[PDB]
Amino acid sequence: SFNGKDYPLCFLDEKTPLLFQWFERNPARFGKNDIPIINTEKNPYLNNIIKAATIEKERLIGIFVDGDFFPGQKDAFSKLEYDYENIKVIYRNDIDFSMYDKKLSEIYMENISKQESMPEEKRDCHLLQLLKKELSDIQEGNDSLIKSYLLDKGHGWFDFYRNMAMLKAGQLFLEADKVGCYDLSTNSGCIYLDADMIITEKLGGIYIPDGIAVHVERIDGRASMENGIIAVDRNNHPALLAGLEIMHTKFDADPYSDGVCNGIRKHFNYSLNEDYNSFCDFIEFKHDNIIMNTSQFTQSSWAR
Ligand SMILES: O=c1ccn([C@@H]2O[C@H](COP(=O)(O)OP(=O)(O)O)[C@@H](O)[C@H]2O)c(=O)[nH]1
Ligand SMILES: [Mn+2]
């Protein structure tokens, strides 16, 4: 309940689901009868998702996947669901995301109109150029903020859908009609981790500040919020909607930074002094049974 105000720390049952996501631009990389989840010796991601499941057998574990997968890879996913009742694998194709949409044309026009109100001296001139050009070009085909996020966004593809999935949260397991899940109810929470996260011992219940907590990394002497960990009390947690509000309003907004980090700041009215590091300590998702993030030591799943 730290400052400025008093915030009700929340606690959610062991029956809180866990969420993993794998978005693969290149399903051809893997074979056509095995799992399209990567586990290089450098980055044993699928192995980490398997290790987590075992431990928290009681808890649900979900995987959010998208890409154009070959049937034997889908058949392979179907097998793992048999192997572990606690694992569910949800596809982007199977979830309605329409409610969270805002068509690209409106975003630009509202920015144009707002920019046009102020006088010619005050207006952002370069921004208006970019807006009108974007409006004319983006016309071709289909104008949806979700459609805007494709494999070619690359980084954007999963980051934005990461926020969509967390917005759905518990509802996501319910929405897919994944089975063996009679623990939880709509308007129930869920925890996202990167496959970078290795889980030593089952975590039990956790107190998070206002129904949300996120990953924090402190190097060299500075901390910034990270999307490796996202914990929510709730489906549709107000910090994410506020982040989505940026997604709907701010031009060229980054889902990683604006969608969440900015949303959280908004919710707790951080700015600005308000020294960050302690605020990062306040928001920080802390646990002694998780290693984070294990891409740090080797090479990020994104090649380099
Ligand atoms: O091709 C990829 C690579 C990564 N990820 C997601 O991003 C996380 C791992 O990214 P990583 O942390 O290794 O990259 P970094 O953020 O360190 O650059 C995983 O949990 C995946 O959910 C993905 O969906 N597709
Ligand atoms: Mn990582």
Residue numbers in the entry: 30 to 333
The authors write:
The non-LEE encoded effector protein B (NleB) has GT activity and inhibits NF-κB activation by transferring N-acetyl glucosamine (GlcNAc) to host death domain-containing proteins and to glyceraldehyde 3-phosphate dehydrogenase (GAPDH). The glycosylation target is an arginine residue, which was unexpected because the guanidine group of arginine is nucleophilically poor at physiological pH. The T3SS effectors SseK1 and SseK2 from Salmonella typhimurium SL1344 are NleB orthologs that behave as NleB1-like GTs, although they differ in protein substrate specificity. Here, by using a combination of X-ray crystallography, STD-NMR, enzyme kinetics, molecular dynamics simulations, and in vivo experiments, we show that these enzymes are GT-A fold retaining GTs that most likely follow an SNi mechanism.
We solved the crystal structures of Salmonella enterica serovar Typhimurium SL1344 SseK1 in complex with UDP. Point mutations (C39S, C210S) were introduced into SseK1 to prevent protein precipitation due to irregular intermolecular disulfide binding. However, in the sandwich-like π-π stacking, the interaction modes of SseK1 and SseK2 are slightly different. In contrast to SseK2, Trp331 from the C-terminal lid of SseK1 interacts with the uracil base instead of Phe203 (second and third panels). While the Kd measured for binding of UDP-GlcNAc to SseK1 F187A was similar to wild type SseK1, the Kd for binding of UDP-GlcNAc to SseK2 F203A was increased about 13-fold as compared to wild type SseK2. These data suggest that although the sandwich-like π-π stacking interactions are maintained, the uracil binding modes within SseK1 and SseK2 are slightly different. The conserved arginine residue in SseK2 and SseK3 (Arg348SseK2, Arg335SseK3), which is located in the lid domain, is substituted to an alanine residue in SseK1 (Ala332SseK1). In the crystal structure of UDP-bound SseK1, the backbone direction of Ala332 is located at the opposite side of UDP. This implies that the lid domain of SseK1 is likely more flexible than SseK2 and SseK3. The arginine on the C-terminus participates in an interaction with UDP-GlcNAc in SseK2 and SseK3, but not in SseK1. Based on this result, the departure of the leaving group is likely to be easier, due to a weaker enzyme-substrate interaction network in SseK1, than in SseK2 and SesK3.
